[PDB]
Structure formats: C-alpha cells, structure tokens
Design a protein. Structure first.
Length: 185
C-alpha cells in the first residue's frame, strides 16, 4: 500500500476526531455498484479494528433532487434507518426512476417501513437541519469534487484509480486493505 498509489495524502487535511468518512450520492451509479455489487463498505468494515468509527454522508452535487436526497439521508441517520432505506432509495432513483419530487422520497421511506409521521417530524427537525449543514461542511472542508469518495482521519483520501483492478475481488480487497493500513497508521 503506497502513498500516491492506493491513497493520497491531502495537502490541506481537516481537523477532527479519528474516523473513516465516506461520501456518496443516490444518483451515482458507481456508488450503487460499490454498495450492491462489490459491497465495498462492508468489506472495509470487516477489516477495521473493532470500534473504529465509520461515517457515511450524502452529497447534493448530483441530480435534480440532490438537495432533497441529502436531507432525506439526514432523516435516515437521525432515525437510524439507513439499513432499511439505502437499497430502496438507489433502486427508486436509478432503476424504477420513481423519485421526481420530495413526496416521492417520502414514499420510499414509508414503503420501507418508516412511519410517515416519524419521517415528517424528522424532515422538519433541528437534528436534520444540523445534519444537512454538517454533511455540507464536511464536503466543503475536504474540497470534495466527486463521489464515491472515502477519507481516513481527515488526512488521506482513498484513490481507487491507483488500485490493482485485475478482477472485481482483487479491487475490493485492495480498497479494504488500503483503509485499514491508514487507520493503523
């Protein structure tokens, strides 16, 4: 695992507690594949020391409802229903293409078993407003230009373009091996 290859050391790191920080968009096909074809984040987690903090934020950059989906992701985090809604949201945005309004996003949450009233209360909550601001600030501070993206300890950015991609499994194992190397460092 080499500096400038599988990862890059940021010229302007960001302050904060140690963590693995991931950014994605429900509009992003590579993000959808990373989740549902490659299971990148699951493989990453499996190789991290027990107790390592992992955080995942959405970005507003892509898509006509990038902002609304970033707020919906905040709702997902606020209510702790990420596992219920992540795949349904990827499917609704990219496959069935049933997400054309904020109302459509709510329907995905409701069909996934999140109570409509809990969704509405969360959407309009202080916690969600704060989480939207925090997601935006984290991306801005890291000068984020695209997704999928992953960072370790605010100091290193994972660089999949520099990884061995001889096969899908070799790539996934490289990605996971790179993250744990940096966390250990």
């Amino acid at each position: 695992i080499s500096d400038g290859k599988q990862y890059i050391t940021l010229d302007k790191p960001v302050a904060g507690e140690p963590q693995v920080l991931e950014f994605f968009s429900f509009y992003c096909p590579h993000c959808y594949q990373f989740e549902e074809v490659l299971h990148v984040s699951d493989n990453v987690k499996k190789k991290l020391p027990e107790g390592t903090k992992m955080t995942k934020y959405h970005v507003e950059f892509l898509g006509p409802l990038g902002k609304e989906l970033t707020q919906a992701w905040a709702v997902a985090m606020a209510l702790g229903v990420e596992d219920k809604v992540t795949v349904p949201l990827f499917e609704a945005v990219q496959k069935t293409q049933t997400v054309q309004s904020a109302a459509d996003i709510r329907k995905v949450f409701v069909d996934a078993g999140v109570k409509g009233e809990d969704y509405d209360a969360a959407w309009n909550s202080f916690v969600v407003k704060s989480l939207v601001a925090q997601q935006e600030k984290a991306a801005a501070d890291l000068q984020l230009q695209g997704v999928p993206a992953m960072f370790v300890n605010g100091k290193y950015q994972i660089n999949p373009q520099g990884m061995d991609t001889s096969s899908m499994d070799v790539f996934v194992q490289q990605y996971a091996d790179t993250v744990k190397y940096l966390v250990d460092k």
